[PDB]
Write a protein that binds this ligand. Structure first.
Ligand SMILES: CCCCCCCCCCCCCCCCCC(=O)OC[C@H](COP(=O)([O-])OCC(O)COP(=O)([O-])OC[C@@H](COC(=O)CCCCCCCCCCCCCCCCC)OC(=O)CCCCCCCCCCCCCCCCC)OC(=O)CCCCCCCCCCCCCCCCC
Ligand SMILES: CCCCCCCCCCCCCCCCCC(=O)OC[C@H](COP(=O)([O-])OCC(O)COP(=O)([O-])OC[C@@H](COC(=O)CCCCCCCCCCCCCCCCC)OC(=O)CCCCCCCCCCCCCCCCC)OC(=O)CCCCCCCCCCCCCCCCC
Ligand SMILES: CCCCCCCCCCCCCCCCC[C@@H](O)O[C@H](CO[C@H](O)CCCCCCCCCCCCCCC)COP(=O)(O)OCC[N+](C)(C)C
Ligand SMILES: CCCCCCCCCCCCCCCCC[C@@H](O)O[C@H](CO[C@H](O)CCCCCCCCCCCCCCC)COP(=O)(O)OCC[N+](C)(C)C
Ligand SMILES: CCCCCCCC/C=C\CCCCCCCC(=O)OC[C@H](COP(=O)(O)OCCN)OC(=O)CCCCCCC/C=C\CCCCCCCC
Ligand SMILES: CCCCCCCC/C=C\CCCCCCCC(=O)O[C@H](COC(=O)CCCCCCC/C=C/CCCCCCCC)COP(=O)(O)OCCN
Ligand SMILES: Nc1ncnc2c1ncn2[C@@H]1O[C@H](COP(=O)(O)OP(=O)(O)O)[C@@H](O)[C@H]1O
Lengths: 49, 98, 347, 320, 54, 459, 104, 55, 122
């Protein structure tokens, strides 16, 4: 209905959306792995298990 | 200190007072700025030569370099000011207040 | 001005600041100040008009005098002890010269007269740069030489800065001058706690920088440089004026907003030494800054001023350039107090 | 990618797109003269984009959908009621004049943006440099106050200094009795009330201020009524002009970059139209402003950004 | 029957160059809308020289 | 006690996610449910407090205040929705958000175990109130009122903060339990005198103390109805609660220090009661009555006896309920006639009989008719003052007279006489207004039925 | 124009009884208004008021008043039977108190 | 006499009057570099004398 | 006054020394981390509001990225803060242990032996 192009089209910018979602999932995976390694390392240093 | 050290510091004080007290011209204040730079160069050179700090012998030269920049900067501004008013009077730099 | 040239000048300003911040030699710190000033002068004159030229001239004169006094202090210190390292400043006269020169560079009272004039004479972007980035280097040097400071001189200048900032800002209808006076008062607050704890100085500087960035970005978003210009914004973008009001509330120092965190901590620190009277006076004086922030909030957000007819056309268009860091800056400037203990990561 | 400093740093430069037919053209003339037909013919022969004269609803045609909006939410002025009651006590005359100046400024920005983005020429009917004559005709007839003229002069001073004047100014000269006869034959019942003094004031304003001062920026092509129908002759006269006297040849690439950043971002264009000068003719109280703004925000495609209004058929919003 | 909102008279308090005007500052003017002052007609006379007859 | 705090933070998105025509219903229903939940805090012990965690605790002094706050929220919701009908949906949600934030801050304030957290919340209560007053007030003086409301508070509370941190550098803790158990006497020195003043003057300005009360008529007259209700009902009691908490560290310096505040409070209750006799504005009369009652509470806290503390608690709760009811009563007439002049509308008992009955009950409870808890608190305070010095019965006695006068004066000016002839738009009372009055008044008599629940920890 | 600006005239107040003769004064929508009245009356009077008063009235004795009464009765009985004084002026045994050595 | 005049005169009105007067004093500068650079000279001399000489 | 900058063994720009690995890491359900995620959500909402988009529904990927970034930064911020407080406690205890003359544990007296002045309230 717009009289102009309205560069943002009906479909989203799939490249940017994919990049955003990929960055989020990569960050979450890295955080989970880092927390696991931190817990194991602390348990090793203090000799709990 | 000897008499030379106090003489150089007195010259620096005189140049600082001369800059801080404006009369009419911006060029006179720029000249006072260069006078302060010259006094600083002389004092630093005397201190470095007296104590035989070999690697510090290059510091005054570096000082001079940046002095030139300051001078050039000031002159640039002066030109623009004159182009606005036809004079280099500091009385015309009063569009902004506190 | 070319975009490439503008980028190069901004990078040179930043590089001068980092050269001051990473150096161990007094000559290199002075060189960083020199390079920063040389690159900063054209940034103030980016949009050419007589007012910008006058502001640049005043800024240059002030900073050149301050740099010359800085060099004199360094030379005297070298004379009385052949030391070039930035350290406990073995001579008291050189230390007084250094304190006065750095105060002139920072805009601390009574070397404050240039700040409102320069801020008023330049654009909002240059004012943002001057009031945020140009504080880092002198404050870093002051933090480094804090052990040999004379508490009387800096405490006098800090109290004068707070008083003069409040009183001067009380009289302003121009937004840039209001920002300049707020900057003077916050400079006083940051320098008051320097002889006691540099971590508090860093925390206060960070919070002030965040708040100032958010304020200036909101002032750029709605093209207002006066009170009456800002009084039209509600008829175009009400969310902007609402966020502006909450930001002004935070800058006023009211709990539970983040602007309360620095002063609070600073007061606490000053009571760990004896120092009871000075924090009380500082808070009572900061009430003035709160007052003129509240007056601005009255004018822009809490009441609706009359508008013009042509505003209707502005309803049909949108903001093209969008600042990406504005929402994060607003959130950090308002909702950060519960994370106060994280300041331990600063030391 | 959106034009900006990055687009200018690498690649994009304006001066290469100018191909000797950039040639901003404006065709001026009094009321009811055939300047629109001449403009359309000039644009057709020279292959330039024609811009119909900016009216009350020009801004509506360029945003959202091209359909005009209600006069209450757009313009808040009437030309017909200006003809009926030129001395209305609600300040309709100066409100209409100010809105028309703002619309002309927006149209000039659009034309300049098109020219600088594509290199294709543009033809306009009237411009911000020509609007003032009508204002003068309002002032000499006592239709508006002197403070209205002062406010108009302030807005014009702060706005028109940021753009370039047209390359060639075409004028069509028609005698006042002939204008009156054309209006009589037209049949519109409102234009019948235009006194000969108003048209005479417009003609004096034109021939004494507009053409003499626009002749210094560039040469002016004046044509009588009879020699305006031969459009091919006018076009061939246009093709043989030596344009090396105005500011246009002295424009290098950086000033073009600045102008291109200014012409887009229409909020920057319209910034100084709403300066906080409180004239009763154009000042609106807080209550009416609030009501009209709330009414505007309820239009079918206006509450959100152009691509985010799901009530006009916008899809995949939650991934934009 | 409706909430009070500021009018032109109220809004004009904030339109001057300063709050709390005094006899000294009542003659100050607010800056131009764009920060561009009108260009001064600073007459820069050209040097007049006699070339000849000697 | 997160079981009460979390439901309010859930009230927030429920309001912001509600349909445009269902905000009031949802807010009222869930506020009432939260009040019902908070009713469980009344089961208190006889020796120590209910220590929920390291951060929150409930005492016998704070539980009735929490219940009063959670009960007041639905009343303000009901009162506000009449004059906000023409307001847009977003602004209505913003108003409800301000009210919810105020209630959350008050709830967290009344249960903080540390004094600094109490300070932070007791100061955070300022922002929503100021926004409400300066945005949704009706006249032009509201802006000025806001300023008077703000700085008057901050000038009193900024020194307190300093004192607070100083104390933590000396004793090592601000936890109220550790402060109570490790209490030490205060010596008679200038430093201790100024520490006392710093600790006391913030709460004094909050009550407010006579001579420091000029902000209150402005703020309570210029604010909207919900703002007035919350200002008079709960926000004044913060000063009393804080003073009763902080007096544990000020002994024995208190006996010497209190004298000027005691004389100010007694002569000021006399003066404010006298001021109420000549007032052309109906809201200002209620404001000055609030000042008089709070002066009585100041005397009660200052003389520092168990009976005085019970009287202070009972009087605070009773005054909160009564003042909220009176402000709502005045607002009904104001909404009818769009004016606050007291002699403009007369003889309203002829046109609105049940509204006149509500007026009568509110005026009766204002003058402390027995056996209402108003009279219980007043009599306990008077007995404690008599034990303190037998001459006080003079001043208190005079107050007991003047109060009644102005109270009945108000009634006689508004309800009796003959109606104004030219006022022909007095519509019949709505169900909403009558229900608001009933929900104000019934808890008062129910509390009279069981008075030990509002008598504080000294019981 | 002899005027200062363009403003809307001050509107007259709307009477809720004009469109709804039984309006309850809650909302202009009759169904929404009726349900607002219903929820306010049910959750204010029926739920919070009466049930809350019943809950508070039967609150179990944690203030330990009956316990204190029974303990007092036991102590009074024992002291009266054994001939001891009912109450002692010292709540702490003097054997555990060490007064200062010198009072001069 | 008391509530509307003197209690107003002492606490809030005196404060407002003093703050307004000091604001007018502080912010009334013509913007001439000559004057406040002279002030800078005075400040430097005073600081060298009062604080620097007492160490 | 800088307390910890000159502490021996400090690496200039480490932000997390190896010794900090000896401490328990903050739990992923730490309420401070939840508050940081709440801050990220608020930033996303304000970003939607400023750009004139549906505040709650405009960009789910953008809001997710905001929340994730805030949580990711907050985790390491909390780690460093806990490390700093542990260092402070360790240094305090070591200094107290190594200077017994400055921290004497004097005799403890029962309340039956201390004379406290009594100030009657009347
Ligand atoms: C003592 C009697 C015992 C009775 C036992 C049962 C009583 C149940 C009462 C329930 C609560 C009362 C209702 C209050 C809200 C008003 C309701 C209403 O809208 O009425 C319209 C309703 C319908 O009529 P209408 O045609 O619409 O008329 C409307 C017109 O406007 C025309 O309206 P109107 O002109 O009829 O106005 C209403 C009327 C009445 O309305 C009211 O004023 C109600 C408020 C009374 C005074 C409140 C201030 C004092 C606070 C005292 C607190 C006591 C709390 C006790 C526990 C109560 C728990 C709820 O006004 C008066 O008559 C003047 C009242 C003067 C009261 C003086 C009492 C002094 C203390 C008495 C002793 C109390 C302790 C006894 C034990 C002592 C030791 C042995 O009329 C009624 O229902 C009758 C009104 C009730 C009168 C009862 C007065 C005595 C009871 C006091 C409270 C209950 C105490 C129960 C224990 C025993 C005491
Ligand atoms: C302490 C405890 C926790 C609380 C934390 C603190 C509070 C919350 C955090 C604050 C930030 C949150 C929201 C930020 C973005 C708001 C921006 C906005 O405009 O909102 C409009 C937006 C509505 O816009 P729309 O839907 O696009 O269409 C309407 C048009 O936009 C129509 O819009 P318009 O532009 O045409 O209307 C113009 C209007 C628009 O102007 C505004 O809307 C003002 C908004 C300013 C945001 C606040 C500034 C930055 C944050 C600082 C907060 C300070 C808190 C400290 C206390 C001091 C109080 C100031 O401006 C005016 O009318 C001027 C009126 C003057 C009033 C001045 C008062 C403003 C300050 C009030 C701040 C109160 C706190 C925020 C409350 C939430 C507000 C939405 O509101 C929302 O829908 C979002 C709010 C709710 C989202 C969260 C719900 C999550 C999902 C529900 C499920 C819950 C999950 C539970 C978990 C367990 C599973 C069961
Ligand atoms: C409209 C027409 C009206 C007139 C007609 C009315 C008809 C009659 C109705 C009136 C009833 C008369 C009352 C007479 C007294 C009977 C009730 C009394 O006996 O119960 C008391 C009990 O009353 C309750 O304790 C008091 C009610 C609690 C009030 C709480 C208010 C509800 C919360 C709402 C929010 C509050 C906000 C304010 C914050 C503080 C006794 O207390 P208690 O000695 O123990 O009981 C001993 C036995 N127990 C302990 C085993 C139970
Ligand atoms: C108002 C909110 C303020 C927030 C400020 C901006 C937040 C985002 C900025 C991100 C910081 C990037 C740093 C991470 C990269 C690693 C760099 C690291 O090596 O730096 C170390 C140090 O790490 C940083 O200093 C920590 C920065 C953390 C800032 C957050 C603290 C804010 C206080 C609490 C407010 C709540 C925060 C909420 C976060 C969203 C170097 O230590 P050191 O060289 O030896 O110290 C130099 C200074 N000395 C010597 C004088 C002491
Ligand atoms: C040593 C320094 C001490 C600092 C004390 C801080 C005081 C905090 C309040 C500051 C208020 C300043 C107000 C002012 O100066 O302006 C005068 C102002 C002019 O109005 P404007 O809004 O500025 O202009 C609009 C029209 N042109 O006059 C007014 O009307 C002010 C009205 C509101 C102010 C009310 C303040 C009430 C505060 C009372 C208690 C505060 C006492 C503070 C000190 C406590 C004692 C230790
Ligand atoms: C709207 C009205 C609100 C305004 C009321 C504000 C006034 C509040 C009262 C003054 C508070 C100032 C005290 C600040 C905190 C003191 C804490 C403390 O204990 O410090 C003392 C020191 O006490 C002080 O330093 C206080 C000095 C006062 C300085 C500030 C003066 C403020 C105005 C004083 C007069 C005001 C009187 C009350 C207000 C009257 C109403 C107008 C001990 O410190 P040491 O140095 O270690 O002593 C032991 C070893 N020598
Ligand atoms: N700036 C203006 N002020 C007043 N009237 C204007 C203005 N611009 C255009 N008009 C009106 O537009 C009407 C027709 O415009 P015109 O261009 O002369 O005819 P045409 O559409 O045939 O080219 C005229 O009645 C004229 O008055």
């Amino acid at each position: 209905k717009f009289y102009i192009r309205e560069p943002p089209h009906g479909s989203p910018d799939w490249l940017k959306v994919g990049l955003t979602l990929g960055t989020s999932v990569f960050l979450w995976i890295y955080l989970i792995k880092q927390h696991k390694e931190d817990v194991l390392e602390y348990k090793r240093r203090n000799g709990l298990e | 200190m000897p008499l030379v050290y106090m003489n150089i510091i007195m010259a620096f004080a005189i140049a600082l007072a001369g800059l801080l007290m404006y009369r009419s011209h911006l060029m006179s204040s720029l000249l006072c700025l260069e006078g302060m730079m010259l006094s600083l160069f002389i004092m630093s050179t005397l201190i470095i030569l007296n104590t035989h700090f070999t690697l510090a012998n290059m510091m005054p030269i570096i000082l001079l370099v940046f002095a030139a920049c300051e001078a050039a900067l000031g002159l640039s501004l002066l030109v623009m000011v004159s182009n606005t008013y036809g004079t280099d009077y500091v009385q015309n730099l009063n569009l902004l207040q506190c | 001005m070319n975009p490439i040239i503008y980028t190069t000048l901004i990078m040179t300003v930043m590089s001068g600041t980092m050269l001051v911040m990473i150096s161990s030699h007094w000559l290199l710190i002075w060189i960083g100040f020199e390079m920063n000033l040389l690159a900063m002068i054209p940034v103030l004159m980016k949009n050419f008009n007589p007012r910008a030229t006058e502001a640049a001239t005043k800024y240059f004169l002030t900073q050149a005098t301050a740099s010359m006094m800085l060099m004199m202090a360094i030379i005297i210190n070298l004379l009385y002890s052949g030391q070039w390292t930035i350290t406990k400043m073995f001579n008291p006269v050189a230390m007084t010269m250094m304190t006065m020169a750095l105060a002139m560079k920072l805009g601390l009272s009574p070397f404050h007269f240039w700040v409102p004039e320069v801020t008023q004479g330049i654009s909002l972007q240059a004012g943002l740069l001057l009031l945020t980035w140009q504080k880092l280097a002198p404050l870093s040097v002051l933090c480094q030489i804090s052990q040999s400071i004379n508490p009387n001189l800096m405490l006098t200048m800090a109290m004068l800065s707070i008083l003069i900032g409040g009183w001067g800002g009380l009289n302003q209808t121009q937004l840039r001058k209001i920002m300049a006076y707020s900057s003077i008062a916050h400079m006083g607050w940051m320098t008051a706690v320097l002889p006691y704890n540099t971590t508090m100085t860093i925390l206060n500087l960070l919070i002030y920088i965040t708040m100032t960035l958010a304020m200036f970005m909101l002032l750029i978003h709605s093209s207002a440089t006066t009170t009456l210009s800002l009084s039209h914004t509600w008829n175009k973008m009400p969310v902007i004026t609402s966020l502006m009001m909450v930001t002004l509330l935070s800058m006023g120092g009211l709990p539970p907003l983040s602007g309360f965190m620095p002063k609070w901590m600073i007061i606490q620190e000053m009571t760990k030494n004896e120092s009871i009277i000075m924090p009380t006076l500082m808070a009572m004086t900061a009430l003035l800054n709160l007052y003129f922030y509240m007056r601005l909030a009255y004018s822009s957000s809490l009441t609706m001023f009359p508008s013009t007819n042509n505003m209707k056309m502005k309803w049909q268009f949108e903001h093209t350039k969008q600042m990406k860091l504005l929402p994060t800056m607003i959130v950090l400037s308002t909702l950060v107090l519960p994370m106060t203990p994280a300041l331990s990561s600063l030391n | 990618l959106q034009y900006g400093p990055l687009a200018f740093v690498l690649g994009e430069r304006t001066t290469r797109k100018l191909t000797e037919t950039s040639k901003v053209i404006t065709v001026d003339g009094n009321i009811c003269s055939g300047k629109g037909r001449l403009a359309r013919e000039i644009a057709e022969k020279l292959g330039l984009r024609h811009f119909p004269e900016a009216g009350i609803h020009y801004a509506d045609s360029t945003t959202g959908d091209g359909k005009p909006l209600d006069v209450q939410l757009s313009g808040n002025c009437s030309l017909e009621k200006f003809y009926d009651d030129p001395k209305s006590n609600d300040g309709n005359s100066y409100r209409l004049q100010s809105w028309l100046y703002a619309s002309r400024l927006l149209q000039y920005a659009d034309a300049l943006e098109h020219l600088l983005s594509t290199g294709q020429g543009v033809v306009l009917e009237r411009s911000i440099y020509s609007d003032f004559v009508f204002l003068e005709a309002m002032y000499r007839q006592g239709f508006i106050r002197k403070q209205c003229v002062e406010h108009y002069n302030e807005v014009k001073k702060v706005t028109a200094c940021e753009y370039l004047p047209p390359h060639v100014v075409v004028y069509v000269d028609v005698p006042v009795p002939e204008i009156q006869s054309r209006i009589q034959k037209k049949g519109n019942p409102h234009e019948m009330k235009i006194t000969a003094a108003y048209l005479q004031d417009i003609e004096n304003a034109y021939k004494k201020t507009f053409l003499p001062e626009m002749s210094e920026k560039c040469e002016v092509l004046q044509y009588s009524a009879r020699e305006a129908e031969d459009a091919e002759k006018v076009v061939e006269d246009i093709e043989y002009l030596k344009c090396d006297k105005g500011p246009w040849p002295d424009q290098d690439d950086r000033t073009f970059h600045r102008l291109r950043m200014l012409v887009q971002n229409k909020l920057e264009v319209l910034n100084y139209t709403t300066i906080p000068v409180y004239l009763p003719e154009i000042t609106i109280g807080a209550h009416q402003s609030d009501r009209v703004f709330q009414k505007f925000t309820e239009l079918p495609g206006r509450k959100y950004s152009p691509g985010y209004n799901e009530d006009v058929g916008d899809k995949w919003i939650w991934l934009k | 029957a409706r909430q009070w909102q500021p009018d032109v008279e109220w809004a004009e308090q904030f339109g001057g160059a300063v709050m709390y005007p005094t006899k000294e500052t009542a003659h100050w003017k607010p800056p131009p809308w764009n920060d561009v002052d009108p260009p001064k007609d600073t007459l820069v006379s050209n040097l007049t020289l006699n070339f000849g007859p000697q | 006690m997160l079981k009460i705090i979390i439901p309010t933070t859930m009230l927030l998105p429920m309001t912001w996610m509600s349909k445009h025509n269902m905000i009031w219903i949802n807010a009222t229903v869930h506020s009432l449910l939260i009040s019902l939940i908070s009713l469980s805090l009344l089961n208190q012990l006889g020796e120590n407090s209910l220590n929920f965690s390291l951060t929150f605790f409930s005492d016998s002094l704070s539980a009735p205040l929490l219940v009063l706050t959670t009960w007041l929220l639905p009343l303000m919701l009901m009162a506000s929705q009449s004059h906000l009908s023409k307001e847009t949906t977003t602004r209505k949600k913003l108003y409800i958000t301000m009210l919810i934030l105020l209630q959350l801050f008050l709830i967290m304030t009344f249960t903080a175990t540390e004094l600094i957290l109490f300070y932070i919340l007791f100061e955070a209560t300022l922002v929503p109130t100021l926004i409400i007053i300066t945005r949704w007030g009706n006249q032009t003086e509201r802006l000025n009122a806001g300023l008077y409301f703000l700085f008057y508070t901050l000038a009193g509370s900024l020194p307190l903060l300093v004192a607070l941190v100083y104390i933590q550098n000396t004793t090592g803790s601000l936890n109220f339990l550790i402060i109570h158990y490790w209490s030490h006497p205060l010596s008679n020195s200038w430093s201790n005198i100024f520490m006392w003043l710093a600790c006391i003057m913030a709460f004094m300005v909050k009550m407010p103390l006579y001579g420091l009360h000029l902000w209150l008529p402005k703020a309570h007259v210029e604010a909207p109805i919900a703002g007035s209700m919350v200002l008079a009902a709960v926000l004044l009691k913060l000063g009393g609660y804080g003073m009763m908490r902080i007096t544990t560290i000020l002994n024995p310096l208190t006996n010497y220090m209190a004298y000027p505040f005691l004389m100010l409070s007694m002569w000021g209750m006399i003066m404010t009661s006298s001021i109420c006799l000549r007032q052309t504005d109906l809201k200002s009369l209620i404001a000055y009555s609030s000042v008089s009652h709070m002066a009585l509470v100041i005397v009660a806290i200052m003389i520092q006896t168990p009976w005085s503390f019970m009287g202070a608690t009972a009087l605070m709760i009773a005054h909160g309920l009564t003042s909220s009811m009176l402000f709502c009563l005045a607002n009904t007439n104001y909404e009818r006639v769009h004016s606050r002049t007291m002699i403009l509308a007369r003889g309203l008992q002829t046109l609105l009989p049940l509204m006149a009955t509500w007026w009568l009950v509110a005026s009766l409870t204002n003058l402390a008719l027995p056996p209402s808890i108003n009279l219980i608190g007043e009599l306990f305070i008077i007995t404690a003052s008599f034990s303190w010095s037998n001459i006080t019965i003079i001043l208190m006695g005079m107050n007991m007279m003047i109060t009644a006068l102005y109270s009945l004066y108000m009634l006689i000016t508004t309800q009796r006489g003959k109606y104004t002839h030219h006022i022909n738009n007095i519509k019949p009372s709505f169900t909403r207004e009558n229900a608001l009055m009933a929900l104000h008044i019934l808890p008062l008599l129910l509390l009279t039925l069981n008075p030990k629940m509002i008598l504080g920890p000294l019981y | 124009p002899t005027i200062r600006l363009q403003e809307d005239p001050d509107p007259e107040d709307e009477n809720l009884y004009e469109k709804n003769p039984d309006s309850h004064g809650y909302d202009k929508d009759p169904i929404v208004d009726l349900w607002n009245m219903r929820v306010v009356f049910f959750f204010g009077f029926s739920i919070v008021l009466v049930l809350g008063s019943t809950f508070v009235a039967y609150l179990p004795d944690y203030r330990m008043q009956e316990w204190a009464r029974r303990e007092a009765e036991r102590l009074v009985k024992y002291r009266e039977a054994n001939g001891l004084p009912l109450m002692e002026s010292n709540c702490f045994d003097p054997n555990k108190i060490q007064l200062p050595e010198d009072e001069d | 006499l008391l509530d509307l005049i003197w209690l107003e005169t002492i606490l809030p009105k005196t404060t407002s009057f003093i703050q307004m007067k000091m604001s007018i004093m502080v912010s009334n500068q013509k913007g001439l570099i000559k004057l406040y650079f002279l002030s800078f000279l005075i400040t430097i001399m005073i600081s060298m004398t009062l604080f620097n000489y007492h160490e | 006054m800088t307390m910890m900058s000159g502490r021996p063994g400090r690496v200039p720009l480490q932000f997390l020394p190896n010794e900090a690995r000896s401490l328990p890491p903050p739990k992923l359900t730490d309420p401070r981390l939840v508050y940081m995620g709440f801050l990220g959500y608020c930033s996303g909402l304000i970003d939607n509001a400023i750009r004139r988009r549906p505040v709650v529904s405009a960009g789910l990927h953008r809001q997710l990225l905001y929340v994730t970034s805030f949580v990711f930064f907050g985790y390491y911020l909390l780690k460093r803060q806990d490390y700093m407080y542990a260092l402070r406690d360790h240094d305090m205890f070591a200094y107290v242990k190594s200077h017994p003359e400055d921290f004497p544990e004097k005799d403890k007296k029962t309340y039956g032996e201390i004379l406290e002045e009594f100030h009657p309230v009347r």
